[PDB]
Every structure is written in structure tokens, then in C-alpha cells.
PDB file of all heavy atoms in Angstrom:
ATOM      1  N   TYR A   1      -1.890 -23.527 -78.518  1.00 28.80           N
ATOM      2  CA  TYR A   1      -2.014 -24.984 -78.542  1.00 28.80           C
ATOM      3  C   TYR A   1      -0.879 -25.596 -79.332  1.00 28.80           C
ATOM      4  O   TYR A   1      -0.216 -26.532 -78.878  1.00 28.80           O
ATOM      5  CB  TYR A   1      -3.384 -25.398 -79.114  1.00 28.80           C
ATOM      6  CG  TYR A   1      -3.569 -26.872 -79.156  1.00 28.80           C
ATOM      7  CD1 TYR A   1      -4.109 -27.563 -78.022  1.00 28.80           C
ATOM      8  CD2 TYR A   1      -3.285 -27.585 -80.299  1.00 28.80           C
ATOM      9  CE1 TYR A   1      -4.264 -28.968 -78.057  1.00 28.80           C
ATOM     10  CE2 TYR A   1      -3.495 -28.964 -80.317  1.00 28.80           C
ATOM     11  CZ  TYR A   1      -4.033 -29.621 -79.245  1.00 28.80           C
ATOM     12  OH  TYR A   1      -4.189 -31.044 -79.249  1.00 28.80           O
ATOM     13  N   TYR A   2      -0.657 -25.061 -80.585  1.00 28.33           N
ATOM     14  CA  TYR A   2       0.417 -25.570 -81.463  1.00 28.33           C
ATOM     15  C   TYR A   2       1.507 -24.528 -81.684  1.00 28.33           C
ATOM     16  O   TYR A   2       2.648 -24.881 -81.546  1.00 28.33           O
ATOM     17  CB  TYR A   2      -0.272 -25.979 -82.782  1.00 28.33           C
ATOM     18  CG  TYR A   2       0.691 -26.692 -83.754  1.00 28.33           C
ATOM     19  CD1 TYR A   2       1.059 -27.976 -83.592  1.00 28.33           C
ATOM     20  CD2 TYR A   2       1.320 -25.941 -84.740  1.00 28.33           C
ATOM     21  CE1 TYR A   2       1.910 -28.640 -84.520  1.00 28.33           C
ATOM     22  CE2 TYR A   2       2.191 -26.562 -85.659  1.00 28.33           C
ATOM     23  CZ  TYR A   2       2.514 -27.886 -85.513  1.00 28.33           C
ATOM     24  OH  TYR A   2       3.364 -28.470 -86.361  1.00 28.33           O
ATOM     25  N   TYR A   3       1.143 -23.334 -82.041  1.00 28.90           N
ATOM     26  CA  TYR A   3       2.132 -22.268 -82.279  1.00 28.90           C
ATOM     27  C   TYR A   3       2.539 -21.620 -80.978  1.00 28.90           C
ATOM     28  O   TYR A   3       1.694 -21.317 -80.145  1.00 28.90           O
ATOM     29  CB  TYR A   3       1.617 -21.202 -83.231  1.00 28.90           C
ATOM     30  CG  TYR A   3       1.316 -21.705 -84.639  1.00 28.90           C
ATOM     31  CD1 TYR A   3       0.166 -21.278 -85.314  1.00 28.90           C
ATOM     32  CD2 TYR A   3       2.137 -22.621 -85.245  1.00 28.90           C
ATOM     33  CE1 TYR A   3      -0.094 -21.665 -86.596  1.00 28.90           C
ATOM     34  CE2 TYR A   3       1.888 -23.089 -86.505  1.00 28.90           C
ATOM     35  CZ  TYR A   3       0.765 -22.587 -87.203  1.00 28.90           C
ATOM     36  OH  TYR A   3       0.481 -23.050 -88.472  1.00 28.90           O
ATOM     37  N   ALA A   4       3.857 -21.506 -80.721  1.00 22.59           N
ATOM     38  CA  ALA A   4       4.346 -20.945 -79.472  1.00 22.59           C
ATOM     39  C   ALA A   4       4.244 -19.441 -79.560  1.00 22.59           C
ATOM     40  O   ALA A   4       5.090 -18.732 -80.164  1.00 22.59           O
ATOM     41  CB  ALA A   4       5.790 -21.326 -79.254  1.00 22.59           C
ATOM     42  N   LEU A   5       3.210 -18.867 -78.986  1.00 18.89           N
ATOM     43  CA  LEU A   5       2.917 -17.464 -79.031  1.00 18.89           C
ATOM     44  C   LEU A   5       3.729 -16.681 -78.003  1.00 18.89           C
ATOM     45  O   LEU A   5       4.260 -15.621 -78.256  1.00 18.89           O
ATOM     46  CB  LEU A   5       1.431 -17.142 -78.819  1.00 18.89           C
ATOM     47  CG  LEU A   5       0.908 -15.762 -79.356  1.00 18.89           C
ATOM     48  CD1 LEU A   5      -0.596 -15.807 -79.336  1.00 18.89           C
ATOM     49  CD2 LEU A   5       1.486 -14.655 -78.552  1.00 18.89           C
ATOM     50  N   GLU A   6       3.856 -17.289 -76.820  1.00 19.46           N
ATOM     51  CA  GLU A   6       4.637 -16.596 -75.714  1.00 19.46           C
ATOM     52  C   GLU A   6       6.019 -16.256 -76.170  1.00 19.46           C
ATOM     53  O   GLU A   6       6.593 -15.249 -75.770  1.00 19.46           O
ATOM     54  CB  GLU A   6       4.626 -17.488 -74.481  1.00 19.46           C
ATOM     55  CG  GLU A   6       5.493 -18.745 -74.538  1.00 19.46           C
ATOM     56  CD  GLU A   6       5.075 -19.746 -75.578  1.00 19.46           C
ATOM     57  OE1 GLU A   6       3.985 -19.542 -76.190  1.00 19.46           O
ATOM     58  OE2 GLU A   6       5.771 -20.713 -75.809  1.00 19.46           O
ATOM     59  N   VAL A   7       6.668 -17.134 -76.999  1.00 19.05           N
ATOM     60  CA  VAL A   7       7.992 -16.865 -77.517  1.00 19.05           C
ATOM     61  C   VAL A   7       7.953 -16.032 -78.776  1.00 19.05           C
ATOM     62  O   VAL A   7       8.810 -15.226 -79.003  1.00 19.05           O
ATOM     63  CB  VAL A   7       8.739 -18.152 -77.721  1.00 19.05           C
ATOM     64  CG1 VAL A   7       8.782 -19.000 -76.417  1.00 19.05           C
ATOM     65  CG2 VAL A   7       8.148 -18.989 -78.812  1.00 19.05           C
ATOM     66  N   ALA A   8       6.948 -16.255 -79.650  1.00 20.00           N
ATOM     67  CA  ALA A   8       6.886 -15.530 -80.909  1.00 20.00           C
ATOM     68  C   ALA A   8       6.715 -14.017 -80.652  1.00 20.00           C
ATOM     69  O   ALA A   8       7.280 -13.174 -81.381  1.00 20.00           O
ATOM     70  CB  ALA A   8       5.724 -16.019 -81.761  1.00 20.00           C
ATOM     71  N   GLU A   9       5.962 -13.678 -79.628  1.00 21.39           N
ATOM     72  CA  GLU A   9       5.755 -12.240 -79.324  1.00 21.39           C
ATOM     73  C   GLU A   9       7.008 -11.484 -79.215  1.00 21.39           C
ATOM     74  O   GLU A   9       7.112 -10.307 -79.550  1.00 21.39           O
ATOM     75  CB  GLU A   9       4.866 -12.140 -78.056  1.00 21.39           C
ATOM     76  CG  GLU A   9       4.562 -10.679 -77.687  1.00 21.39           C
ATOM     77  CD  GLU A   9       3.651  -9.999 -78.700  1.00 21.39           C
ATOM     78  OE1 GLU A   9       3.133 -10.685 -79.570  1.00 21.39           O
ATOM     79  OE2 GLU A   9       3.489  -8.762 -78.567  1.00 21.39           O
ATOM     80  N   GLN A  10       8.051 -12.129 -78.702  1.00 20.07           N
ATOM     81  CA  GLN A  10       9.343 -11.496 -78.534  1.00 20.07           C
ATOM     82  C   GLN A  10      10.332 -11.883 -79.628  1.00 20.07           C
ATOM     83  O   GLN A  10      11.353 -11.142 -79.871  1.00 20.07           O
ATOM     84  CB  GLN A  10       9.990 -11.842 -77.159  1.00 20.07           C
ATOM     85  CG  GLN A  10      10.206 -13.399 -76.961  1.00 20.07           C
ATOM     86  CD  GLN A  10      10.830 -13.662 -75.614  1.00 20.07           C
ATOM     87  OE1 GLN A  10      11.131 -12.750 -74.864  1.00 20.07           O
ATOM     88  NE2 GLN A  10      11.026 -14.925 -75.354  1.00 20.07           N
ATOM     89  N   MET A  11      10.179 -12.990 -80.373  1.00 21.12           N
ATOM     90  CA  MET A  11      11.012 -13.371 -81.435  1.00 21.12           C
ATOM     91  C   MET A  11      10.732 -12.754 -82.716  1.00 21.12           C
ATOM     92  O   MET A  11      11.677 -12.545 -83.521  1.00 21.12           O
ATOM     93  CB  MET A  11      10.922 -14.924 -81.622  1.00 21.12           C
ATOM     94  CG  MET A  11      11.877 -15.502 -82.638  1.00 21.12           C
ATOM     95  SD  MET A  11      11.724 -17.290 -82.800  1.00 21.12           S
ATOM     96  CE  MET A  11      12.245 -17.826 -81.157  1.00 21.12           C
ATOM     97  N   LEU A  12       9.552 -12.323 -82.999  1.00 25.17           N
ATOM     98  CA  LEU A  12       9.137 -11.613 -84.225  1.00 25.17           C
ATOM     99  C   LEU A  12       8.733 -10.222 -84.077  1.00 25.17           C
ATOM    100  O   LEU A  12       8.374  -9.563 -85.066  1.00 25.17           O
ATOM    101  CB  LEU A  12       8.017 -12.442 -84.905  1.00 25.17           C
ATOM    102  CG  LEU A  12       8.331 -13.917 -85.285  1.00 25.17           C
ATOM    103  CD1 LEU A  12       7.096 -14.606 -85.880  1.00 25.17           C
ATOM    104  CD2 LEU A  12       9.506 -14.007 -86.220  1.00 25.17           C
ATOM    105  N   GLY A  13       8.783  -9.668 -82.858  1.00 26.20           N
ATOM    106  CA  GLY A  13       8.357  -8.318 -82.600  1.00 26.20           C
ATOM    107  C   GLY A  13       9.491  -7.319 -82.720  1.00 26.20           C
ATOM    108  O   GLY A  13       9.420  -6.193 -82.225  1.00 26.20           O
ATOM    109  N   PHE A  14      10.534  -7.706 -83.460  1.00 29.22           N
ATOM    110  CA  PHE A  14      11.681  -6.780 -83.677  1.00 29.22           C
ATOM    111  C   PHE A  14      11.562  -5.915 -84.880  1.00 29.22           C
ATOM    112  O   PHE A  14      12.108  -4.841 -84.899  1.00 29.22           O
ATOM    113  CB  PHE A  14      12.990  -7.592 -83.682  1.00 29.22           C
ATOM    114  CG  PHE A  14      13.046  -8.617 -84.835  1.00 29.22           C
ATOM    115  CD1 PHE A  14      13.678  -8.271 -86.032  1.00 29.22           C
ATOM    116  CD2 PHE A  14      12.518  -9.901 -84.663  1.00 29.22           C
ATOM    117  CE1 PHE A  14      13.731  -9.156 -87.102  1.00 29.22           C
ATOM    118  CE2 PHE A  14      12.579 -10.793 -85.770  1.00 29.22           C
ATOM    119  CZ  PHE A  14      13.208 -10.425 -86.941  1.00 29.22           C
ATOM    120  N   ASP A  15      10.939  -6.452 -85.918  1.00 28.50           N
ATOM    121  CA  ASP A  15      10.697  -5.681 -87.162  1.00 28.50           C
ATOM    122  C   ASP A  15       9.208  -5.422 -87.327  1.00 28.50           C
ATOM    123  O   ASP A  15       8.358  -6.116 -86.753  1.00 28.50           O
ATOM    124  CB  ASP A  15      11.250  -6.410 -88.378  1.00 28.50           C
ATOM    125  CG  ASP A  15      12.772  -6.310 -88.473  1.00 28.50           C
ATOM    126  OD1 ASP A  15      13.377  -5.409 -87.809  1.00 28.50           O
ATOM    127  OD2 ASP A  15      13.372  -7.123 -89.146  1.00 28.50           O
ATOM    128  N   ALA A  16       8.920  -4.449 -88.192  1.00 30.58           N
ATOM    129  CA  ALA A  16       7.471  -4.092 -88.458  1.00 30.58           C
ATOM    130  C   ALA A  16       6.807  -5.230 -89.203  1.00 30.58           C
ATOM    131  O   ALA A  16       7.379  -5.843 -90.098  1.00 30.58           O
ATOM    132  CB  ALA A  16       7.405  -2.835 -89.268  1.00 30.58           C
ATOM    133  N   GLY A  17       5.575  -5.545 -88.856  1.00 29.87           N
ATOM    134  CA  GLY A  17       4.795  -6.583 -89.418  1.00 29.87           C
ATOM    135  C   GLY A  17       4.099  -7.449 -88.402  1.00 29.87           C
ATOM    136  O   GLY A  17       2.985  -7.993 -88.665  1.00 29.87           O
ATOM    137  N   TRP A  18       4.659  -7.565 -87.264  1.00 29.34           N
ATOM    138  CA  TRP A  18       4.019  -8.402 -86.144  1.00 29.34           C
ATOM    139  C   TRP A  18       2.984  -7.581 -85.424  1.00 29.34           C
ATOM    140  O   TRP A  18       1.856  -8.041 -85.189  1.00 29.34           O
ATOM    141  CB  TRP A  18       5.133  -8.907 -85.207  1.00 29.34           C
ATOM    142  CG  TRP A  18       4.505  -9.751 -84.096  1.00 29.34           C
ATOM    143  CD1 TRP A  18       4.232  -9.307 -82.798  1.00 29.34           C
ATOM    144  CD2 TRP A  18       4.210 -11.121 -84.100  1.00 29.34           C
ATOM    145  NE1 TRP A  18       3.719 -10.304 -82.032  1.00 29.34           N
ATOM    146  CE2 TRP A  18       3.709 -11.431 -82.822  1.00 29.34           C
ATOM    147  CE3 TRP A  18       4.271 -12.085 -85.064  1.00 29.34           C
ATOM    148  CZ2 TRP A  18       3.296 -12.730 -82.507  1.00 29.34           C
ATOM    149  CZ3 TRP A  18       3.856 -13.370 -84.766  1.00 29.34           C
ATOM    150  CH2 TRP A  18       3.362 -13.705 -83.469  1.00 29.34           C
ATOM    151  N   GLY A  19       3.338  -6.356 -85.028  1.00 29.98           N
ATOM    152  CA  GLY A  19       2.439  -5.454 -84.377  1.00 29.98           C
ATOM    153  C   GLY A  19       1.134  -5.187 -85.133  1.00 29.98           C
ATOM    154  O   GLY A  19       0.050  -5.503 -84.777  1.00 29.98           O
ATOM    155  N   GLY A  20       1.362  -4.540 -86.339  1.00 29.12           N
ATOM    156  CA  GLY A  20       0.282  -4.260 -87.227  1.00 29.12           C
ATOM    157  C   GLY A  20      -0.646  -3.150 -86.676  1.00 29.12           C
ATOM    158  O   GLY A  20      -0.727  -2.891 -85.469  1.00 29.12           O
ATOM    159  N   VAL A  21      -1.332  -2.417 -87.581  1.00 28.11           N
ATOM    160  CA  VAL A  21      -2.244  -1.369 -87.209  1.00 28.11           C
ATOM    161  C   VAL A  21      -3.580  -1.958 -86.802  1.00 28.11           C
ATOM    162  O   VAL A  21      -3.974  -3.014 -87.235  1.00 28.11           O
ATOM    163  CB  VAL A  21      -2.359  -0.314 -88.329  1.00 28.11           C
ATOM    164  CG1 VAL A  21      -1.040   0.295 -88.645  1.00 28.11           C
ATOM    165  CG2 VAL A  21      -2.983  -0.992 -89.606  1.00 28.11           C
ATOM    166  N   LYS A  22      -4.307  -1.211 -85.996  1.00 31.45           N
ATOM    167  CA  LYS A  22      -5.617  -1.600 -85.443  1.00 31.45           C
ATOM    168  C   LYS A  22      -5.630  -3.058 -85.034  1.00 31.45           C
ATOM    169  O   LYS A  22      -6.642  -3.767 -85.294  1.00 31.45           O
ATOM    170  CB  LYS A  22      -6.740  -1.252 -86.499  1.00 31.45           C
ATOM    171  CG  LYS A  22      -6.580  -2.022 -87.826  1.00 31.45           C
ATOM    172  CD  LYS A  22      -7.765  -1.793 -88.703  1.00 31.45           C
ATOM    173  CE  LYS A  22      -7.646  -2.550 -90.020  1.00 31.45           C
ATOM    174  NZ  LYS A  22      -6.475  -2.150 -90.805  1.00 31.45           N
ATOM    175  N   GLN A  23      -4.602  -3.516 -84.381  1.00 33.23           N
ATOM    176  CA  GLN A  23      -4.460  -4.906 -83.948  1.00 33.23           C
ATOM    177  C   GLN A  23      -4.672  -5.857 -85.127  1.00 33.23           C
ATOM    178  O   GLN A  23      -5.573  -6.740 -85.125  1.00 33.23           O
ATOM    179  CB  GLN A  23      -5.476  -5.198 -82.847  1.00 33.23           C
ATOM    180  CG  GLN A  23      -5.319  -6.545 -82.181  1.00 33.23           C
ATOM    181  CD  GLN A  23      -6.349  -6.763 -81.071  1.00 33.23           C
ATOM    182  OE1 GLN A  23      -7.204  -5.944 -80.802  1.00 33.23           O
ATOM    183  NE2 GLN A  23      -6.226  -7.930 -80.384  1.00 33.23           N
ATOM    184  N   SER A  24      -3.791  -5.719 -86.101  1.00 33.25           N
ATOM    185  CA  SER A  24      -3.811  -6.604 -87.269  1.00 33.25           C
ATOM    186  C   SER A  24      -2.398  -7.178 -87.527  1.00 33.25           C
ATOM    187  O   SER A  24      -1.513  -7.090 -86.644  1.00 33.25           O
ATOM    188  CB  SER A  24      -4.233  -5.751 -88.506  1.00 33.25           C
ATOM    189  OG  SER A  24      -4.278  -6.603 -89.658  1.00 33.25           O
ATOM    190  N   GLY A  25      -2.229  -7.844 -88.695  1.00 32.35           N
ATOM    191  CA  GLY A  25      -0.950  -8.415 -88.991  1.00 32.35           C
ATOM    192  C   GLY A  25      -0.936  -9.918 -88.851  1.00 32.35           C
ATOM    193  O   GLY A  25      -1.929 -10.577 -89.092  1.00 32.35           O
ATOM    194  N   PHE A  26       0.216 -10.498 -88.466  1.00 35.35           N
ATOM    195  CA  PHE A  26       0.346 -11.959 -88.282  1.00 35.35           C
ATOM    196  C   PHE A  26      -0.085 -12.400 -86.884  1.00 35.35           C
ATOM    197  O   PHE A  26      -0.434 -13.634 -86.778  1.00 35.35           O
ATOM    198  CB  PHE A  26       1.788 -12.379 -88.529  1.00 35.35           C
ATOM    199  CG  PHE A  26       2.277 -12.025 -89.962  1.00 35.35           C
ATOM    200  CD1 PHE A  26       2.796 -10.823 -90.246  1.00 35.35           C
ATOM    201  CD2 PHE A  26       2.131 -13.019 -90.931  1.00 35.35           C
ATOM    202  CE1 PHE A  26       3.257 -10.555 -91.511  1.00 35.35           C
ATOM    203  CE2 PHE A  26       2.595 -12.721 -92.231  1.00 35.35           C
ATOM    204  CZ  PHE A  26       3.128 -11.505 -92.555  1.00 35.35           C
ATOM    205  N   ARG A  27      -0.052 -11.555 -85.931  1.00 36.58           N
ATOM    206  CA  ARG A  27      -0.393 -11.936 -84.564  1.00 36.58           C
ATOM    207  C   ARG A  27      -1.881 -12.413 -84.471  1.00 36.58           C
ATOM    208  O   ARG A  27      -2.170 -13.481 -83.871  1.00 36.58           O
ATOM    209  CB  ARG A  27      -0.130 -10.814 -83.535  1.00 36.58           C
ATOM    210  CG  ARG A  27      -0.417 -11.217 -82.080  1.00 36.58           C
ATOM    211  CD  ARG A  27      -0.054 -10.070 -81.124  1.00 36.58           C
ATOM    212  NE  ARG A  27      -0.947  -8.913 -81.353  1.00 36.58           N
ATOM    213  CZ  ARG A  27      -0.686  -7.895 -82.163  1.00 36.58           C
ATOM    214  NH1 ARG A  27       0.396  -7.841 -82.904  1.00 36.58           N
ATOM    215  NH2 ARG A  27      -1.564  -6.938 -82.234  1.00 36.58           N
ATOM    216  N   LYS A  28      -2.805 -11.562 -84.996  1.00 37.76           N
ATOM    217  CA  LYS A  28      -4.210 -12.004 -84.966  1.00 37.76           C
ATOM    218  C   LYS A  28      -4.460 -13.232 -85.726  1.00 37.76           C
ATOM    219  O   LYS A  28      -5.233 -14.137 -85.321  1.00 37.76           O
ATOM    220  CB  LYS A  28      -5.026 -10.829 -85.482  1.00 37.76           C
ATOM    221  CG  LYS A  28      -6.518 -11.075 -85.394  1.00 37.76           C
ATOM    222  CD  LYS A  28      -7.338  -9.858 -85.910  1.00 37.76           C
ATOM    223  CE  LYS A  28      -8.811 -10.136 -85.823  1.00 37.76           C
ATOM    224  NZ  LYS A  28      -9.615  -8.919 -86.305  1.00 37.76           N
ATOM    225  N   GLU A  29      -3.812 -13.429 -86.934  1.00 40.52           N
ATOM    226  CA  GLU A  29      -4.026 -14.624 -87.741  1.00 40.52           C
ATOM    227  C   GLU A  29      -3.496 -15.819 -86.989  1.00 40.52           C
ATOM    228  O   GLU A  29      -4.101 -16.890 -87.054  1.00 40.52           O
ATOM    229  CB  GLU A  29      -3.368 -14.443 -89.107  1.00 40.52           C
ATOM    230  CG  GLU A  29      -3.770 -15.489 -90.054  1.00 40.52           C
ATOM    231  CD  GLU A  29      -5.253 -15.449 -90.472  1.00 40.52           C
ATOM    232  OE1 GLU A  29      -5.889 -14.479 -90.072  1.00 40.52           O
ATOM    233  OE2 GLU A  29      -5.705 -16.404 -91.106  1.00 40.52           O
ATOM    234  N   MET A  30      -2.379 -15.715 -86.311  1.00 42.51           N
ATOM    235  CA  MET A  30      -1.830 -16.864 -85.574  1.00 42.51           C
ATOM    236  C   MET A  30      -2.713 -17.187 -84.423  1.00 42.51           C
ATOM    237  O   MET A  30      -2.925 -18.368 -84.098  1.00 42.51           O
ATOM    238  CB  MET A  30      -0.429 -16.535 -85.118  1.00 42.51           C
ATOM    239  CG  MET A  30       0.275 -17.705 -84.398  1.00 42.51           C
ATOM    240  SD  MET A  30       1.936 -17.237 -83.855  1.00 42.51           S
ATOM    241  CE  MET A  30       2.793 -16.971 -85.399  1.00 42.51           C
ATOM    242  N   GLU A  31      -3.283 -16.198 -83.753  1.00 41.85           N
ATOM    243  CA  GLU A  31      -4.186 -16.442 -82.641  1.00 41.85           C
ATOM    244  C   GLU A  31      -5.429 -17.152 -83.166  1.00 41.85           C
ATOM    245  O   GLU A  31      -5.925 -18.101 -82.515  1.00 41.85           O
ATOM    246  CB  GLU A  31      -4.587 -15.138 -81.936  1.00 41.85           C
ATOM    247  CG  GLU A  31      -3.442 -14.515 -81.182  1.00 41.85           C
ATOM    248  CD  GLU A  31      -3.810 -13.185 -80.491  1.00 41.85           C
ATOM    249  OE1 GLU A  31      -4.957 -12.766 -80.670  1.00 41.85           O
ATOM    250  OE2 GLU A  31      -2.958 -12.608 -79.860  1.00 41.85           O
ATOM    251  N   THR A  32      -5.969 -16.698 -84.325  1.00 44.40           N
ATOM    252  CA  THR A  32      -7.101 -17.406 -84.894  1.00 44.40           C
ATOM    253  C   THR A  32      -6.823 -18.796 -85.241  1.00 44.40           C
ATOM    254  O   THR A  32      -7.662 -19.708 -85.039  1.00 44.40           O
ATOM    255  CB  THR A  32      -7.670 -16.637 -86.113  1.00 44.40           C
ATOM    256  OG1 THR A  32      -6.606 -16.388 -86.994  1.00 44.40           O
ATOM    257  CG2 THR A  32      -8.233 -15.273 -85.627  1.00 44.40           C
ATOM    258  N   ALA A  33      -5.638 -19.085 -85.823  1.00 43.01           N
ATOM    259  CA  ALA A  33      -5.256 -20.407 -86.161  1.00 43.01           C
ATOM    260  C   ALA A  33      -5.131 -21.298 -84.904  1.00 43.01           C
ATOM    261  O   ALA A  33      -5.524 -22.460 -84.938  1.00 43.01           O
ATOM    262  CB  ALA A  33      -3.923 -20.391 -86.949  1.00 43.01           C
ATOM    263  N   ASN A  34      -4.511 -20.757 -83.854  1.00 45.15           N
ATOM    264  CA  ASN A  34      -4.449 -21.532 -82.626  1.00 45.15           C
ATOM    265  C   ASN A  34      -5.818 -21.820 -82.030  1.00 45.15           C
ATOM    266  O   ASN A  34      -6.108 -22.932 -81.527  1.00 45.15           O
ATOM    267  CB  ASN A  34      -3.570 -20.826 -81.591  1.00 45.15           C
ATOM    268  CG  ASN A  34      -2.151 -20.589 -82.102  1.00 45.15           C
ATOM    269  OD1 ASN A  34      -1.610 -21.390 -82.861  1.00 45.15           O
ATOM    270  ND2 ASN A  34      -1.513 -19.478 -81.639  1.00 45.15           N
ATOM    271  N   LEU A  35      -6.743 -20.864 -82.112  1.00 44.23           N
ATOM    272  CA  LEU A  35      -8.094 -21.084 -81.660  1.00 44.23           C
ATOM    273  C   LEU A  35      -8.809 -22.145 -82.444  1.00 44.23           C
ATOM    274  O   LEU A  35      -9.524 -23.039 -81.929  1.00 44.23           O
ATOM    275  CB  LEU A  35      -8.895 -19.811 -81.695  1.00 44.23           C
ATOM    276  CG  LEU A  35      -8.464 -18.699 -80.695  1.00 44.23           C
ATOM    277  CD1 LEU A  35      -9.195 -17.393 -80.949  1.00 44.23           C
ATOM    278  CD2 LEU A  35      -8.688 -19.167 -79.229  1.00 44.23           C
ATOM    279  N   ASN A  36      -8.533 -22.161 -83.769  1.00 42.59           N
ATOM    280  CA  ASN A  36      -9.139 -23.220 -84.674  1.00 42.59           C
ATOM    281  C   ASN A  36      -8.575 -24.556 -84.293  1.00 42.59           C
ATOM    282  O   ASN A  36      -9.308 -25.546 -84.301  1.00 42.59           O
ATOM    283  CB  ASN A  36      -8.881 -22.848 -86.074  1.00 42.59           C
ATOM    284  CG  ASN A  36      -9.548 -23.821 -87.063  1.00 42.59           C
ATOM    285  OD1 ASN A  36      -8.941 -24.890 -87.402  1.00 42.59           O
ATOM    286  ND2 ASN A  36     -10.767 -23.532 -87.521  1.00 42.59           N
ATOM    287  N   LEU A  37      -7.269 -24.644 -84.041  1.00 41.86           N
ATOM    288  CA  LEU A  37      -6.650 -25.991 -83.697  1.00 41.86           C
ATOM    289  C   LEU A  37      -7.214 -26.429 -82.331  1.00 41.86           C
ATOM    290  O   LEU A  37      -7.483 -27.617 -82.180  1.00 41.86           O
ATOM    291  CB  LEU A  37      -5.121 -25.809 -83.620  1.00 41.86           C
ATOM    292  CG  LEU A  37      -4.421 -26.176 -84.952  1.00 41.86           C
ATOM    293  CD1 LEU A  37      -4.741 -25.129 -86.039  1.00 41.86           C
ATOM    294  CD2 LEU A  37      -2.960 -26.242 -84.687  1.00 41.86           C
ATOM    295  N   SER A  38      -7.392 -25.525 -81.358  1.00 40.41           N
ATOM    296  CA  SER A  38      -7.939 -25.941 -80.109  1.00 40.41           C
ATOM    297  C   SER A  38      -9.380 -26.391 -80.303  1.00 40.41           C
ATOM    298  O   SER A  38      -9.889 -27.395 -79.663  1.00 40.41           O
ATOM    299  CB  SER A  38      -7.890 -24.801 -79.117  1.00 40.41           C
ATOM    300  OG  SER A  38      -8.615 -23.674 -79.575  1.00 40.41           O
ATOM    301  N   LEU A  39     -10.159 -25.712 -81.180  1.00 43.30           N
ATOM    302  CA  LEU A  39     -11.550 -26.111 -81.436  1.00 43.30           C
ATOM    303  C   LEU A  39     -11.576 -27.495 -82.115  1.00 43.30           C
ATOM    304  O   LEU A  39     -12.466 -28.281 -81.803  1.00 43.30           O
ATOM    305  CB  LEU A  39     -12.194 -25.035 -82.303  1.00 43.30           C
ATOM    306  CG  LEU A  39     -13.718 -25.187 -82.570  1.00 43.30           C
ATOM    307  CD1 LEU A  39     -14.309 -23.870 -82.916  1.00 43.30           C
ATOM    308  CD2 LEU A  39     -13.969 -26.176 -83.726  1.00 43.30           C
ATOM    309  N   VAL A  40     -10.634 -27.779 -83.014  1.00 44.66           N
ATOM    310  CA  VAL A  40     -10.575 -29.081 -83.633  1.00 44.66           C
ATOM    311  C   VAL A  40     -10.220 -30.151 -82.626  1.00 44.66           C
ATOM    312  O   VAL A  40     -10.778 -31.259 -82.646  1.00 44.66           O
ATOM    313  CB  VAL A  40      -9.639 -29.090 -84.801  1.00 44.66           C
ATOM    314  CG1 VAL A  40      -9.330 -30.466 -85.313  1.00 44.66           C
ATOM    315  CG2 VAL A  40     -10.103 -28.170 -85.923  1.00 44.66           C
ATOM    316  N   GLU A  41      -9.345 -29.868 -81.718  1.00 44.64           N
ATOM    317  CA  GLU A  41      -8.993 -30.836 -80.672  1.00 44.64           C
ATOM    318  C   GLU A  41     -10.230 -31.082 -79.792  1.00 44.64           C
ATOM    319  O   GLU A  41     -10.526 -32.223 -79.444  1.00 44.64           O
ATOM    320  CB  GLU A  41      -7.833 -30.285 -79.804  1.00 44.64           C
ATOM    321  CG  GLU A  41      -7.380 -31.263 -78.731  1.00 44.64           C
ATOM    322  CD  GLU A  41      -6.834 -32.581 -79.333  1.00 44.64           C
ATOM    323  OE1 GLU A  41      -6.587 -32.643 -80.536  1.00 44.64           O
ATOM    324  OE2 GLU A  41      -6.603 -33.532 -78.534  1.00 44.64           O
TER     325      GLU A  41
END
């Protein structure tokens, strides 16, 4: 909704930290934030 995930997946997936173990890191938090923004809308 607000954060561009389609582009971030390739813009920040070059160094360790975006992928994360057991599906963790910044990707899940950004997805949760986008879901919260959509819920607020």
C-alpha cells in the first residue's frame, strides 16, 4: 500500500539482512507494516 515491496525485494536483497532465517528480518516487518496501513485505510 505504502512501501514499494515489489522493488524492495530486488533493491535490498543484495546483502544479508533482507532474507533472514525462518522467514524473518525486515521483509516480514515491512509486510506487517503495509498490512497495518491497509487496515487503517
Side-chain angles (χ1 to χ4, degrees):
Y1 182 87
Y2 186 82
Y3 296 141
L5 201 170
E6 73 295 353
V7 305
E9 182 64 12
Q10 59 179 359
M11 185 179 296
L12 301 177
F14 62 95
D15 285 341
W18 180 264
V21 298
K22 62 174 181 299
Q23 190 179 2
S24 181
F26 299 88
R27 185 177 65 269
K28 183 178 180 180
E29 192 65 11
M30 184 180 296
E31 290 178 0
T32 53
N34 299 330
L35 291 173
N36 182 275
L37 269 65
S38 60
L39 187 155
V40 170
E41 183 64 12

